[PDB]
Amino acid sequence: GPHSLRYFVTAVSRPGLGEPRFIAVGYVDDTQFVRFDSDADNPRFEPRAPWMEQEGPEYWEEQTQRAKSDEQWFRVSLRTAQRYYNQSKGGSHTFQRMFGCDVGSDWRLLRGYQQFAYDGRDYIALNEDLKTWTAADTAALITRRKWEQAGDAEYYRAYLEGECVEWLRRYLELGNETLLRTDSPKAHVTYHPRSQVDVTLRCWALGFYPADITLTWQLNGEDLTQDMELVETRPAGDGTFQKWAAVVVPLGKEQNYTCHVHHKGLPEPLTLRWK
């Protein structure tokens, strides 16, 4: 590996618009493979990767049933949290759920995640020991008492150790030709005449995977990653990503700056100079 399996579940209340919207997206590494959307026609988990369709109906049945369960679970938890905060009933609120798991190359659990957030803010989160809970406030404190009373930790701690992993190993095989791949980034530096003395140089990183990558500018050893114009790595749509960094520099000094690309697919970081 190392590899990871993640599910990002979202639930937002709709005051006077009917029941709340429940969305669930599942990922492996930086690739999306499953989804559930209450606002869809005939809600049910569906594959989003070609290699997921290689799964039987029973897999799909079960998955859907759980998503449907959590749809109820969230309607209530959302009404519950509403009271906890003494908020009014005509306001919409967001409840987020994160869970999944990181695995080492030994294919054994390495890190487990089960956390919650209300209205965009940390609410309650399992700790690394997988036996304790970290409540963000007094309201989340009554939730920890409940969840410990039911020994929920145990079950989740059990899920991460077994399920997510066993299934991760599987998803990885089914989608090996696209999950195991590594597309190196294709870099170049564009010249953009700024003023009469400056020029905006920009080196791009295209077609790479995993999403993780390092783009930097340097001036005679000097690291300028604070004076850089750096975007947030972005998806191209075909399963790979792009990104770029830009620096403003003087005329006739363009050659004095280098661009350094670091990625998993490159056996040795790239470097680029203009002219």
Partner: protein, 99 residues
């Protein structure tokens, strides 16, 4: 609270006049999840736009992506109009061939 949406507008491949390509609009770091992304062509709304599933990042901020089929020319303009509570007015961002 309310995080302002970050919007990047860019094509899938390096553009070439007349050659079919794909325009994307990546909206990130916004909250709440309520959001309205609209891709446009020459001021007009392009109907055949598709959305990736809504999802957030570790820091909890949501992110989504819009895309569509398009054959770029020297005359047509493209843009992504995004409306979100964190803002007063809808924010629009035109695609730049060099961005």
């Amino acid at each position: 609270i309310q995080k302002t949406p970050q919007i990047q507008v860019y094509s899938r491949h390096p553009p070439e006049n007349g050659k079919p390509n794909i325009l994307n609009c990546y909206v990130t770091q916004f909250h709440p999840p309520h959001i309205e992304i609209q891709m446009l062509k020459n001021g007009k709304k392009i109907p055949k736009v598709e959305m990736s599933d809504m999802s957030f990042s570790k820091d909890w901020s949501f992110y989504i992506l819009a895309h569509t089929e398009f054959t770029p020319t020297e005359t047509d303009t493209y843009a992504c109009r995004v409306k979100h509570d964190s803002m007063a007015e809808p924010k629009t961002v035109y695609w730049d061939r060099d961005m």
